[PDB]
Amino acid sequence: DPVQLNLLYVQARDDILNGSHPVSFDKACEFAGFQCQIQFGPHNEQKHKAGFLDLKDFLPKEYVKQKGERKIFQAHKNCGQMSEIEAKVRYVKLARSLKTYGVSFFLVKEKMKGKNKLVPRLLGITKECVMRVDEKTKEVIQEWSLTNIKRWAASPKSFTLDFGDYQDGYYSVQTTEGEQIAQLIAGYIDIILKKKKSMPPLTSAQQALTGTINSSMQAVQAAQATLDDFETLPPLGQDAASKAWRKNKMDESKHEIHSQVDAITAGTASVVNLTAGDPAETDYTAVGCAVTTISSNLTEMSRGVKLLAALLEDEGGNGRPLLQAAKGLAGAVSELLRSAQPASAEPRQNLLLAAGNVGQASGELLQQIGESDTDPHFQDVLMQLANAVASAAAALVLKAKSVAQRTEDSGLQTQVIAAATQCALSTSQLVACTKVVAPTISSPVCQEQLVEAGRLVAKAVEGCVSASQAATEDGQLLRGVGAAATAVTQALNELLQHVKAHATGAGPAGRYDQATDTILTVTENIFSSMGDAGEMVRQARILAQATSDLVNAIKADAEGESDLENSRKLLSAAKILADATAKMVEAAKGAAAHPDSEEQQQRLREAAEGLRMATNAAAQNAIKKKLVQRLEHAAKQAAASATQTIAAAQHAASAPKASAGPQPLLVQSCKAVAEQIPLLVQGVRGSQAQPDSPSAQLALIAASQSFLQPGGKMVAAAKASVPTIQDQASAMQLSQCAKNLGTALAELRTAAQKAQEACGPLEMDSALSVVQNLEKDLQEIKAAARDGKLKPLPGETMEKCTQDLGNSTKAVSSAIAKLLGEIAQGNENYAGIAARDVAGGLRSLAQAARGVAALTSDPAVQAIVLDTASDVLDKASSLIEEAKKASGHPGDPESQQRLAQVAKAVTQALNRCVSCLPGQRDVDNALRAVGDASKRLLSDLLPPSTGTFQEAQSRLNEAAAGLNQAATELVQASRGTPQDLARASGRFGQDFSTFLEAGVEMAGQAPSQEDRAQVVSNLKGISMSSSKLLLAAKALSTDPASPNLKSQLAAAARAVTDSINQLITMCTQQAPGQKECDNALRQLETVRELLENPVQPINDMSYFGCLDSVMENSKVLGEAMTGISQNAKNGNLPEFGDAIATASKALCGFTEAAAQAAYLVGVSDPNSQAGQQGLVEPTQFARANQAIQMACQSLGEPGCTQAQVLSAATIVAKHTSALCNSCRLASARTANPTAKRQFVQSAKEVANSTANLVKTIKALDGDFTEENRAQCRAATAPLLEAVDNLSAFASNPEFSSVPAQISPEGRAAMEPIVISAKTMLESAGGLIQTARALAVNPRDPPRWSVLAGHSRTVSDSIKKLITSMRDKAPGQLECETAIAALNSCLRDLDQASLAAVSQQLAPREGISQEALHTQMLTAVQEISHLIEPLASAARAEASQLGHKVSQMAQYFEPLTLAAVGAASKTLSHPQQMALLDQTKTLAESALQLLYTAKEAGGNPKQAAHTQEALEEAVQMMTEAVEDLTTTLNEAASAAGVVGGMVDSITQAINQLDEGPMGDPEGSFVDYQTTMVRTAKAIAVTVQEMVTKSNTSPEELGPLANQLTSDYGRLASQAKPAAVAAENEEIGAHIKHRVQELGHGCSALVTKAGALQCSPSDVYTKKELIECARRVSEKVSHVLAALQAGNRGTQACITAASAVSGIIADLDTTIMFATAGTLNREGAETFADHREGILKTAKVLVEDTKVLVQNAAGSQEKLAQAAQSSVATITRLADVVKLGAASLGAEDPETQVVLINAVKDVAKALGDLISATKAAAGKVGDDPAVWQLKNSAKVMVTNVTSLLKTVKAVEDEATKGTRALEATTEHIRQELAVFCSPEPPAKTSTPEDFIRMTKGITMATAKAVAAGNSCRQEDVIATANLSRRAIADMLRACKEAAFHPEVAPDVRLRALHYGRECANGYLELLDHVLLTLQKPNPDLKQQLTGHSKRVAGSVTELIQAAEAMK
């Protein structure tokens, strides 16, 4: 039956056509062809064209718009004319052919694995299969059987399905129809199952709190026990330095106990605050954090007080009271922790009583210590204020109780009663927290706790107000309102008193306390607002008022005082103030007169500084002192926070005791800061004790600035350790301490900077006094030595004293080099810094010398070390004196020469002081033996005896073997006792004497004089290398454990054996033919000794690099061993020798590569850490130096031949070029600005001397003039002096290195390479000896057998070493481990999401959601910090790669845990799914990055595609991290909590201050404009925050988040702008102002968060308003500092924005005039406005030409140019609006064309402004200036168009002419805009495209109509309308062009179509102009054809716009 077949065809056609069956384009085309065969019959070639075949019912509606109609037509022509029933059967057969037929299909948006994006996938459901299906190919991309599904999951937004068995991971896809998908697949699964035939009960959070508190109480008891015993102290003696040690340790212990009692009081306050909530609501882990803070700081306090008690009991004072106080505190703490236990059922009053007891106990303890400076009057005030608040709250409770008595309704009454009880409870809690916090009120964290209690009590008061309002409008409501007002006012008074005592300068105030403070603040503002005339002059005027008031007051007080002399002095001070104010006012007037002249602004700033200086003398120097006390408060807070962080880190890292992870790095940083703290405390105390001593203030500033760096490192390490720590309470405590340390460090930066400007320059007068005090102290040490009682300080061991003495001498020499460099740069204050560094190094040297004297027992040793140290100190005192005399007055060559002589003297003294140390011995004796032997070689070489030339030559060869032996003995002894190396050095000296005796014998015994030159040169070289070797041995002697010194010694041994080889190759005759084998074996021995101990790299080239080098050198060794074997077979001497030499060079290269590979494998072990490799590579530096001295010595010898002269010149050029390169790299690598400056200066000086020497030697090449040779000799010296200055400077131990610390298992994995290479070297030495024998005897069987054996042993060792190198391959085992870990985290997240679908996820009850989000955000921050270095390692090196992958894994596990928690807590299912999905995206992107990094593996040979995969993985990871960070930040800012906002701002400040500098990409101007944009954005954000505070306070959150992210953007670009500015003062100012604004923003955001959490508080709103005012002032200051950039111009940005505002005004006028609102006023004519326009336009073109001529030059003239240009354009716009008014609204199109003309003129001026900005002070031939003139031409064209338009719009005769030509000009510039490819800001959708295309159709219809009409009215109307339409169309098309989601092909097609349309309309416009000109009736008829081409262009534009979406 064919009917059923037709019905099957019907169903198939229905399914395919309607779109309910997934089918791709092609098989749809064949099904359409079958449709043609059925219902259109056989195809006819020409009858089946396009246009008639309706496609809607003929192809699937989803694919009809594919518009491949032609393809369909030839498919039809192909289908044939064959019968139709077979068409039906083929239709049904092809229907059943597809896998996609007969089953349901759903479009479900799927998330691609790795991105936060979505792609539709047509999921299908089958009786047998579940298959994903791509939308565009409609073919199965992946398949799943039903029988494997276990639990699907339906949600109204998503449908998640699982498999478990097949693929680890589940199927997540979101869709609106999840419910029916799930129920449908449920039924299909059911049929497959059918087919088979057969509160005393504590919560877990409370349990964890109980555990933490029990452990803490155990620690409290075990710390209470240790108190009873005085600890001990090491014997110290009455040494003056030891007395200072005792006092310093006493002071440090006092400060430390103060910090921990601060921490204990804050912890108890926090316990009170947190436990106040209802149970089952408290943040229990925060309570645990508080108890751990208490107990940890208690144990450290017990240690501190034991030490302090011992130190006191040495003095008369008794330690029993202090022990009693500490034991009382410990008992109070133990009782509190007894009360805080959740299981206890005591009333809350017990806990509050315990907290009060802790407060009083800590107060008593602080009284005993002698540190509670907080005056007892202030504690009295606090207590009476808190009691006043309690009384007022009691009164409010009375009123509330009365109201509850009056009211009647049940339920309401209990609400009122509950509110009253809450008020009473919260005020009692506030009183008790005040009791707790009173003794330790300086600590900010205590104050935060107390303001938290205050916020709680205010919230309860507002609750009481609401409860009163529940009543009914009685006078009792008025009384309740009154009671609330007193309670809030009383709380504010306590909070205000509180904040006042937060930062109190001191007890006494002084008589000018307030006036001086105000002038300080206003001068600070004047300094801050550099480069802004208005702010400067306003601040100058307010300053003048304040200081005039101060002068009046001081004059009145001078009248009051009675003594004639004192009154005269005070009146003179008043006179000085008045004079300074008069000069400042004059400077301000001058600045205001010429606002944009930087000279006047500099004069005003200098006048303000002079006023400050006068004030410091007019009164007691309060301003300097005031800034000093602010710094002291900041430094005390920083030290206290550092101690708290150290305590937290120690307590947290003890439990896991993991040698991996970030704890060991944290421990090293903690130790560094713990040795840095006492210096800060000592400086603070020195400044506290001496207020008027400038040296103490400078020492304090220096101590704080030094503390800044290690503090930042601890902060970073602590932030990195938090996610790893398993103890949540310890983790939170460490996190809080890290945040507080960061804040304190930022404020320390700001305060230290402020003081450094405050205190004058160091003047290098303090350094002289410091070295003088060192001399006097050392004299007293000498006196004590004469007493025979000089004792060692407790920490000093004689070996450590030696090491520190060596380091101090090197640092002193480096700082002397700095000082000479700075003086040579001329009269610098940096010379003061250099003098300070010299003095510091000298203090360290004196300390080490005293220690060395104390440890040693011989009186003569003590006397001699004291003598040499005092000599060093006095020589350096003379050096400092000469430095002062030099920096006083520049321009004196005698100054530089005398400074050089004194530096030489002090360096010699330093070397004596090192050598004077009797520990190292016989190194000086051996060095002197070398020197004396060299000098006896030096002169009159004449052979004393001929002897036997050849036999004594053999003797010389034996002496060479002996010298090699002795050098190998040195390099071996370098791993033994210092006595071993000393005796080895002596033996080497004796052997060198023997060898040089043989050398001097053959010096004269050689007949020819050419050989005499050879021997003398080679002997000088050998002597110099030996001297360097002995100096390296000396360096080892003074410091035995350092591995860099050991590697230097091995390198020196290599150099000496190399020089031996050079001498034997050159001078000794080649007659034996075996000397090259001798040199071979020498090098073999030396390089084996290099191989023996791989702990530092002897090379830079990395692991896979050294594998490549091993491959290459194994190839060379193979070819050379074949060569030597065959040449021994053939007995050919010269090539045999050459092949042996090549084999030996290959062996040496191989052993260098294997040593480096061993070192790399050792470092790559997880436990081991690497080092920073120092600045200048030591071995290369030494080689370059020695080459330079050798070349200059070659130039030094009198007989100058051309060959040697040119060789020396080339060698010097090459080596000094490499040296300057190294200096530049070092200056680009270091962080000390002085280091950068001096490295650059040294590079400049060495380059200058190199150029001088090169020019002199080029004047010498080919001339040989004796006077020219003398000139060369004279110029030789400065190069050596410069390279010596560089060697001295770059020897600073700070630059040197940090030895890599190798794990023991690291050495275990290191050994195999060393073993195999040692065996190979032994085999190769044997082979060399056998080959020498073969050279002796031509043939012998056993010898050839052993030669083959040695060659095969070499080969086997090579193969084994290669096997080990390839099999280890560091960085691909821990990558596998990390990948497994990340996949486990993926499974955990996927299972959590699956649980969360069907609503089974259990919200953990312990911790608050905010803390979970903070946990997630810290983990995300760490992963974000790690991403980039992981990529960098995956590109270059392997060891760092392994470390990075391990770190990323350890961070990715706790992030998963916290994400599960925070998703569980959230209730809104879409939000929790968002968190789970973004976290899963981050995990997936990390997994992909680890895959691609294990692929690349740090192999530079990796394919380009793997590098591309790595880069795209990194970009995916960065995107995922930023997406998750934004989700978390927004979700945390929706709630009022502000945490991670102030954290991010302080972190951004810190990141701004530190980091790497490189002079980055980009100029200054682009950074300036972007960052001025950001500054404007933050200013308008804070203003919006101000308005939203009053209006609607729930909008404070998102605004705060926006402000924090904007400040992060501002501070990310601040450092590159700072380092890119043409002057460093400018960049410094920008950095300082950005940091100060950071402080302001942190404060403002804290206030905004507080207000959003307490919306109705009258006072926090106030403080928010003043914080916003302050941050607005800071934004004004940073904008002003950005205006100080001459390059470009801030005037250009302001001009661009002003003309943009003008354009906005003109567009508004377009709107008004088009609406017809713009009407005539009176009888205003148009002609007068026309002359106005003409004048203004001529002035505008003059402004344009003056701008183009002024574009290159100072900022001033360009500023007037731009300002005048903007003034002229706005005046022109105003007169244009007036003229448009004069034209009346009756003809709006004329006004529209006028405004469009002036508006495009404004656009041209804006483009001209941008062009002028891009070309400021450039060369004449830069492309920017050509672009500028192009812009000027465009501006001229536009203004001429305006001129002609007005000139002939006076009359209507030429309306159409001008309108039409203006329109064609504007379309021409539109197509010109298309000529330049740039992306439009917006990207529009095709709906606007259809709109604009319909507009074009209407415009062209009206164009044809107007052309027919030839009437000016419709012509100008068409001109305007079509101009706007076409311009807007092209704008939207370009918006769609650079839009990434639009494919490049269709964007190009759309550009083609738009260009065609624009052209066609342009020729249409020229044709309408032709139609207007001549009557042209045929041309008017032709316009129709132009319209037809326009319509075709419109059609293709419709196609292009419809194509995309």
Coordinates of N, CA, C and O in Angstrom, one line a residue, residues 981-1068:
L981 N 92.5 24.4 55.3 CA 92.6 25.3 54.1 C 93.8 26.3 54.3 O 94.5 26.6 53.3
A982 N 94.1 26.7 55.5 CA 95.3 27.5 55.8 C 96.6 26.8 55.4 O 97.4 27.4 54.7
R983 N 96.7 25.6 55.9 CA 98.0 24.8 55.6 C 98.0 24.5 54.1 O 99.1 24.5 53.5
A984 N 96.9 24.2 53.5 CA 96.9 24.0 52.1 C 97.3 25.2 51.3 O 98.0 25.1 50.3
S985 N 96.8 26.4 51.7 CA 97.3 27.6 51.1 C 98.8 27.8 51.2 O 99.4 28.3 50.3
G986 N 99.3 27.5 52.4 CA 100.8 27.7 52.6 C 101.5 26.7 51.6 O 102.5 27.1 51.0
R987 N 101.1 25.5 51.5 CA 101.7 24.5 50.7 C 101.6 24.9 49.2 O 102.6 24.7 48.4
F988 N 100.5 25.4 48.8 CA 100.3 26.0 47.5 C 101.3 27.1 47.2 O 101.8 27.2 46.1
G989 N 101.5 28.0 48.2 CA 102.4 29.1 48.0 C 103.8 28.6 47.8 O 104.5 29.0 46.9
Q990 N 104.3 27.6 48.6 CA 105.6 27.0 48.4 C 105.7 26.4 47.0 O 106.7 26.6 46.3
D991 N 104.7 25.6 46.6 CA 104.8 25.0 45.3 C 104.8 26.0 44.2 O 105.4 25.8 43.1
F992 N 104.1 27.1 44.4 CA 104.1 28.2 43.4 C 105.5 28.8 43.3 O 105.9 29.2 42.2
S993 N 106.1 28.9 44.5 CA 107.5 29.4 44.4 C 108.4 28.5 43.6 O 109.2 29.0 42.8
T994 N 108.2 27.2 43.8 CA 109.0 26.2 43.0 C 108.7 26.4 41.5 O 109.6 26.5 40.6
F995 N 107.4 26.4 41.1 CA 107.0 26.5 39.7 C 107.5 27.8 39.1 O 108.0 27.8 38.0
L996 N 107.4 28.9 39.8 CA 107.8 30.1 39.2 C 109.3 30.2 39.2 O 109.9 30.9 38.3
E997 N 110.0 29.5 40.0 CA 111.5 29.4 39.9 C 111.8 28.7 38.5 O 112.7 29.2 37.8
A998 N 111.1 27.6 38.2 CA 111.3 27.0 36.9 C 111.0 27.9 35.8 O 111.7 28.0 34.8
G999 N 109.9 28.7 36.0 CA 109.4 29.6 34.9 C 110.4 30.7 34.7 O 110.7 31.1 33.5
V1000 N 111.0 31.3 35.7 CA 112.0 32.3 35.6 C 113.3 31.8 35.0 O 114.1 32.5 34.4
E1001 N 113.6 30.5 35.3 CA 114.7 29.8 34.6 C 114.5 29.8 33.1 O 115.4 30.3 32.3
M1002 N 113.4 29.3 32.6 CA 113.1 29.3 31.2 C 112.7 30.7 30.7 O 112.6 30.8 29.4
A1003 N 112.6 31.7 31.5 CA 112.4 33.1 31.0 C 113.6 33.5 30.3 O 113.5 34.1 29.2
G1004 N 114.8 33.3 30.8 CA 116.0 33.7 30.2 C 116.7 32.6 29.5 O 117.5 32.9 28.6
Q1005 N 116.4 31.4 29.8 CA 117.1 30.3 29.1 C 116.7 30.1 27.7 O 117.4 29.6 26.8
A1006 N 115.5 30.6 27.4 CA 115.0 30.5 26.0 C 115.8 31.4 25.1 O 116.0 32.6 25.4
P1007 N 116.4 30.9 24.0 CA 117.3 31.7 23.1 C 116.6 32.9 22.5 O 117.0 34.0 22.7
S1008 N 115.5 32.7 21.8 CA 114.8 33.7 21.1 C 114.1 34.7 22.1 O 113.7 34.3 23.1
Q1009 N 114.1 36.0 21.7 CA 113.4 37.0 22.6 C 111.9 36.9 22.4 O 111.2 37.4 23.3
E1010 N 111.4 36.5 21.3 CA 109.9 36.3 21.2 C 109.5 35.3 22.2 O 108.4 35.5 22.8
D1011 N 110.2 34.2 22.4 CA 109.8 33.2 23.4 C 110.0 33.9 24.8 O 109.3 33.5 25.7
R1012 N 110.9 34.8 25.0 CA 111.0 35.5 26.2 C 109.8 36.4 26.5 O 109.3 36.4 27.6
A1013 N 109.3 37.0 25.5 CA 108.0 37.8 25.6 C 106.9 36.8 26.0 O 106.1 37.1 26.9
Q1014 N 106.8 35.7 25.3 CA 105.8 34.7 25.6 C 105.9 34.2 27.1 O 104.8 34.2 27.8
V1015 N 107.1 33.9 27.6 CA 107.2 33.3 28.9 C 106.9 34.4 29.9 O 106.2 34.2 30.9
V1016 N 107.3 35.7 29.7 CA 107.0 36.7 30.7 C 105.5 37.0 30.7 O 105.0 37.1 31.8
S1017 N 104.9 37.0 29.6 CA 103.4 37.3 29.6 C 102.7 36.2 30.3 O 101.8 36.4 31.1
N1018 N 103.0 34.9 29.9 CA 102.2 33.8 30.5 C 102.5 33.7 32.0 O 101.7 33.3 32.8
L1019 N 103.7 34.1 32.4 CA 104.1 34.0 33.8 C 103.4 35.1 34.6 O 102.9 34.8 35.7
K1020 N 103.2 36.3 34.1 CA 102.4 37.3 34.7 C 101.0 36.8 34.8 O 100.3 37.0 35.9
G1021 N 100.4 36.2 33.8 CA 99.1 35.7 33.9 C 98.9 34.6 34.9 O 97.9 34.6 35.7
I1022 N 99.8 33.7 35.0 CA 99.8 32.6 36.0 C 99.9 33.2 37.4 O 99.1 32.8 38.3
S1023 N 100.8 34.2 37.6 CA 100.9 34.8 38.9 C 99.6 35.5 39.3 O 99.2 35.4 40.5
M1024 N 99.0 36.2 38.4 CA 97.8 37.0 38.7 C 96.6 36.0 39.0 O 95.9 36.2 40.0
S1025 N 96.5 34.9 38.3 CA 95.5 33.9 38.6 C 95.7 33.3 39.9 O 94.8 33.0 40.7
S1026 N 97.0 33.0 40.3 CA 97.3 32.5 41.6 C 97.0 33.4 42.7 O 96.5 33.0 43.8
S1027 N 97.2 34.7 42.5 CA 96.9 35.7 43.5 C 95.4 35.8 43.7 O 94.9 35.8 44.8
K1028 N 94.6 35.7 42.6 CA 93.1 35.6 42.7 C 92.7 34.4 43.5 O 91.8 34.4 44.3
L1029 N 93.4 33.3 43.2 CA 93.0 32.0 43.9 C 93.3 32.1 45.4 O 92.5 31.7 46.2
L1030 N 94.4 32.7 45.8 CA 94.7 32.8 47.2 C 93.8 33.8 47.8 O 93.4 33.6 49.0
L1031 N 93.4 34.9 47.1 CA 92.4 35.8 47.7 C 91.0 35.1 47.9 O 90.3 35.3 48.9
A1032 N 90.6 34.2 47.0 CA 89.4 33.4 47.2 C 89.6 32.5 48.4 O 88.6 32.4 49.2
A1033 N 90.7 31.9 48.5 CA 91.0 31.1 49.7 C 90.8 31.9 51.0 O 90.3 31.4 52.0
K1034 N 91.3 33.2 51.0 CA 91.2 34.0 52.1 C 89.7 34.3 52.4 O 89.3 34.2 53.6
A1035 N 88.9 34.6 51.4 CA 87.5 34.8 51.6 C 86.8 33.5 52.2 O 86.0 33.7 53.1
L1036 N 87.2 32.3 51.8 CA 86.7 31.1 52.4 C 87.2 31.1 53.9 O 86.4 30.7 54.7
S1037 N 88.4 31.5 54.1 CA 88.9 31.4 55.5 C 88.1 32.3 56.4 O 87.9 31.9 57.6
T1038 N 87.7 33.4 56.0 CA 86.9 34.3 56.9 C 85.4 33.9 57.0 O 84.7 34.4 57.8
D1039 N 85.0 32.9 56.1 CA 83.6 32.5 56.1 C 83.6 31.1 55.5 O 83.5 30.9 54.3
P1040 N 83.5 30.1 56.4 CA 83.7 28.7 55.9 C 82.5 28.1 55.2 O 82.6 27.3 54.3
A1041 N 81.3 28.4 55.7 CA 80.1 27.7 55.3 C 79.5 28.2 54.0 O 78.6 27.5 53.4
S1042 N 79.8 29.4 53.6 CA 79.1 30.0 52.5 C 79.5 29.2 51.2 O 80.7 29.1 50.9
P1043 N 78.5 28.8 50.4 CA 78.8 28.0 49.2 C 79.2 28.9 48.0 O 79.9 28.4 47.1
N1044 N 78.8 30.2 48.0 CA 79.2 31.0 46.9 C 80.7 31.2 46.9 O 81.4 31.2 45.8
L1045 N 81.3 31.4 48.1 CA 82.7 31.5 48.2 C 83.4 30.2 47.7 O 84.4 30.3 47.0
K1046 N 82.8 29.1 48.1 CA 83.4 27.8 47.6 C 83.4 27.7 46.1 O 84.4 27.3 45.5
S1047 N 82.3 28.1 45.5 CA 82.2 28.1 44.0 C 83.2 29.0 43.4 O 83.8 28.7 42.4
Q1048 N 83.4 30.2 44.0 CA 84.4 31.1 43.5 C 85.8 30.5 43.6 O 86.6 30.7 42.7
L1049 N 86.1 29.8 44.7 CA 87.4 29.2 44.8 C 87.6 28.1 43.8 O 88.7 28.0 43.2
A1050 N 86.6 27.3 43.5 CA 86.7 26.3 42.4 C 86.9 27.0 41.1 O 87.7 26.5 40.3
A1051 N 86.2 28.1 40.8 CA 86.4 28.8 39.6 C 87.9 29.4 39.5 O 88.5 29.3 38.4
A1052 N 88.4 29.9 40.6 CA 89.8 30.3 40.6 C 90.8 29.2 40.3 O 91.8 29.4 39.6
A1053 N 90.5 28.0 40.9 CA 91.4 26.9 40.5 C 91.3 26.6 39.1 O 92.3 26.2 38.4
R1054 N 90.1 26.6 38.5 CA 89.9 26.4 37.0 C 90.8 27.5 36.3 O 91.5 27.1 35.3
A1055 N 90.7 28.7 36.7 CA 91.5 29.8 36.1 C 93.0 29.5 36.1 O 93.7 29.7 35.2
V1056 N 93.5 29.0 37.3 CA 94.9 28.8 37.4 C 95.4 27.6 36.6 O 96.4 27.7 35.9
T1057 N 94.6 26.5 36.6 CA 95.0 25.4 35.7 C 94.9 25.8 34.2 O 95.7 25.4 33.4
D1058 N 93.9 26.7 33.9 CA 93.8 27.2 32.5 C 95.1 28.0 32.1 O 95.6 27.9 31.0
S1059 N 95.6 28.8 33.1 CA 96.8 29.6 32.8 C 98.0 28.7 32.7 O 98.9 29.0 31.8
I1060 N 98.1 27.6 33.5 CA 99.1 26.7 33.3 C 99.1 26.1 31.9 O 100.1 25.9 31.3
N1061 N 97.9 25.7 31.5 CA 97.8 25.1 30.1 C 98.2 26.1 29.1 O 98.8 25.7 28.1
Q1062 N 97.8 27.4 29.2 CA 98.2 28.4 28.2 C 99.7 28.5 28.2 O 100.3 28.5 27.1
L1063 N 100.4 28.5 29.3 CA 101.8 28.7 29.3 C 102.5 27.5 28.7 O 103.4 27.6 27.9
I1064 N 102.0 26.3 29.0 CA 102.7 25.1 28.5 C 102.4 25.0 27.0 O 103.3 24.5 26.2
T1065 N 101.2 25.4 26.5 CA 100.9 25.3 25.1 C 101.8 26.3 24.3 O 102.3 26.0 23.2
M1066 N 101.9 27.5 24.9 CA 102.7 28.6 24.1 C 104.2 28.4 24.2 O 104.8 28.2 23.1
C1067 N 104.7 28.3 25.4 CA 106.2 28.5 25.5 C 107.0 27.2 25.4 O 107.9 27.1 24.6
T1068 N 106.6 26.1 26.1 CA 107.3 24.9 26.0 C 107.2 24.3 24.6 O 106.1 24.4 23.9

